[PDB]
Amino acid sequence: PGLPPGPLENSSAKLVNDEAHPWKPLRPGDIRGPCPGLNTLASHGYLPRNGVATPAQIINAVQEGFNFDNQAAIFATYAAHLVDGNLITDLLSIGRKTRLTGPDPPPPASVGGLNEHGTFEGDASMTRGDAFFGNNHDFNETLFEQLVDYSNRFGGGKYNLTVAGELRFKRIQDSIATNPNFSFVDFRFFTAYGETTFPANLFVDGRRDDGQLDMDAARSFFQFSRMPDDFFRAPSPRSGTGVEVVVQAHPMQPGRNVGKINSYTVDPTSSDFSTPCLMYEKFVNITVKSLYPNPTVQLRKALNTNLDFLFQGVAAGCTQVFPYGR
Ligand code: HEM
Ligand SMILES: *[C@@H]1O[C@H](CO)[C@@H](O)[C@H](O)[C@H]1NC(C)=O
Ligand SMILES: *[C@@H]1O[C@H](CO)[C@@H](O)[C@H](O)[C@H]1NC(C)=O
Ligand SMILES: *[C@@H]1O[C@H](CO)[C@@H](O)[C@H](O)[C@H]1NC(C)=O
Ligand SMILES: *[C@@H]1O[C@H](CO)[C@@H](O)[C@H](O)[C@H]1NC(C)=O
Ligand SMILES: *[C@@H]1O[C@H](CO)[C@@H](O)[C@H](O)[C@H]1NC(C)=O
Ligand SMILES: [Cl-]
Ligand SMILES: [Mg+2]
Incomplete structure (x- = not known):
């Protein structure tokens, strides 16, 4: 395993839809999942296009494509990798799930990719359906049209933190009403709130950075994994700033x-x-x-290395836990 990258040396806004990173359509075998951020990075060649x-x-x-902050990047990536990735390869x-991640570890580990329900991915996503309804990963037009409607009602036609606050709650209440297996605890309880800020903080052109995402750009990212023509990334590192508005x-x-x-x-x-430290401790002690x-x-060595990396992304004040000793 390579070391976690450090923060950007230069975190200014800049053109990220550039000649070296053109959008291309999917080829047979190319994998896209429930995250429009990673999907877009893959479809512009910031990640491998498969x-x-x-x-x-x-x-x-x-970091390079969207100015996601280093701590948030480390925590999310190593959490996902621990529960969904192949730790040996x-x-x-x-x-x-794909054979491209290499020979699988023994059960009960699943190495199911980001599509694996209940490890990282969970219910009440904005533009993806709950796993119970048959598809937790593809863009859903009806759910996106609801996002548009909430943007019209609460954001003057744009998606902003006020829209996020209302839509977050609507999706929770709809899952309560229709998904008898709805789960909204621990890791998912946290990500469900943070994720609703990301379109306002990261899909808004960095020359503006005003928190108001237009619906043309929203569809481009959420459906087509495509940056707008001439898209500038955010002007500084961030992830979940304003999540308090959504909770409130x-x-x-x-x-x-x-x-x-x-x-x-x-x-x-x-x-x-x-209890943010408890979320971390339960994720390691129970989920992993x-x-x-x-x-x-x-595997034990690979687990311990990736768990050390995960802890680099944990907020200061928490105590590291060691499920396989030191
Ligand atoms: C750093 C590593 C990242 C990982 C491993 C990751 C993974 C995921 C996963 C698994 C989901 C699905 C959540 C669920 O259903 O419970 C998700 C949602 C989301 N991610 Fe990411 N993500 C990352 C970074 C980013 C970045 C940088 C952006 C934006 C630039 C982004 C934007 C989103 C959005 C908007 C959603 C919500 C989609 C929806 O509910 O419709 N993510 N992410
Ligand atoms: C950082 O990048 C920006 C945008 O490309 C550029 O204008 C600026 O001069 C760079 N700063 C340094 C210190 O190189
Ligand atoms: C149902 O919920 C359980 C955990 O409570 C989870 O293991 C399972 O994958 C869920 N399945 C679906 C389709 O929601
Ligand atoms: C999209 O979401 C809607 C509303 O929850 C659901 O009824 C529909 O089956 C989902 N899938 C597709 C392919 O539209
Ligand atoms: C969202 O947009 C609406 C309409 O412009 C506005 O009233 C509200 O203050 C905005 N919220 C944020 C957090 O920008
Ligand atoms: C996690 O396990 C460690 C021992 O390795 C223990 O000290 C800690 O209290 C546990 N935390 C939880 C939330 O189970
Ligand atoms: Cl950073
Ligand atoms: Mg989901």
Whole structure:
């Protein structure tokens, strides 16, 4: 495994839809998944165009192409890789499970790519359906049209943090009403809020950086994995700034439906925004450990290396935990 890349040496706004990074359509076998950011980076050649990449490639791409901040890049990438990637070959699919990530580890590890439900990916996504409904990864036109409607109603036709606050809650309530297996705890509880800020913070042309995403650009990213012509990345490193506005709009507790619709039951063992270090500890002690309960020598070493890298992305003040010793 390569070392996690450091922050950008020059984080100014600049043209990122440039001659070296043209949009190209998918070829047979090219993989796209539930993340429009990574999808767009792959479709502009910031990542390998087939959608299989190393953690270091992913971190470099999100920084270079979108000015995603280093700490957020490290945490997200190594979390995803630990639960969805191949730790021996150092390869992660940004979408469906693929033989291209190499020989699989033993069960119960799945190495399912970002499409794997319940490891990283989860319910109440904005433009992707819940896994229960049959497809957690493809762009969904009806859900996107709802995003447009919420942008018209709360953002004057643009997507901004006010729109994010209302749409986040709408998607939660729709999943409660229709998905008897709806889960909204721990890792997903956190990412579900942060992700709604990303279109406002990262898909807005960096010469403006005003938090108001137009619907032409929104469709280009969300559906076609395509930067607008002449797209400048954000003018400084960021990820989830303004997430407090989204939470404040409709504060929620972590919980799940309990095998029936309209049965949302709060989980007091879940982390929430008052316990960010617990989210990290549970992710390692429960989620990662359950995939690799008794790893053989080379897997144990790879796990420990990637867990060290994950901890570099954890907010200061948390204590590192060691599921396979020091
Ligand atoms: C740094 C590594 C990244 C990883 C591993 C990653 C992975 C993911 C995954 C797995 C999801 C699906 C979440 C779910 O259903 O629970 C997601 C959602 C999302 N990601 Fe990323 N992501 C990364 C960076 C970024 C960046 C840099 C951007 C924007 C420039 C971005 C924009 C989004 C958006 C907008 C969604 C929400 C899609 C929707 O709900 O319709 N992500 N990401
Ligand atoms: C950083 O990049 C910007 C945009 O390409 C450029 O104008 C600026 O001069 C660069 N700064 C340094 C210190 O090289
Ligand atoms: C149902 O929820 C459980 C966890 O509560 C999860 O393991 C499973 O993958 C979920 N399946 C779908 C399709 O939502
Ligand atoms: C898209 O989402 C809608 C609304 O939840 C759902 O009814 C539909 O089956 C999804 N899939 C497609 C292919 O439209
Ligand atoms: C979203 O846009 C609407 C209409 O322009 C505006 O009232 C609201 O203040 C905006 N919110 C943010 C956070 O920019
Ligand atoms: C995680 O495991 C460590 C021991 O390796 C323990 O000290 C810590 O309390 C655990 N945290 C949780 C939330 O289970
Ligand atoms: Cl940074
Ligand atoms: Mg999802």
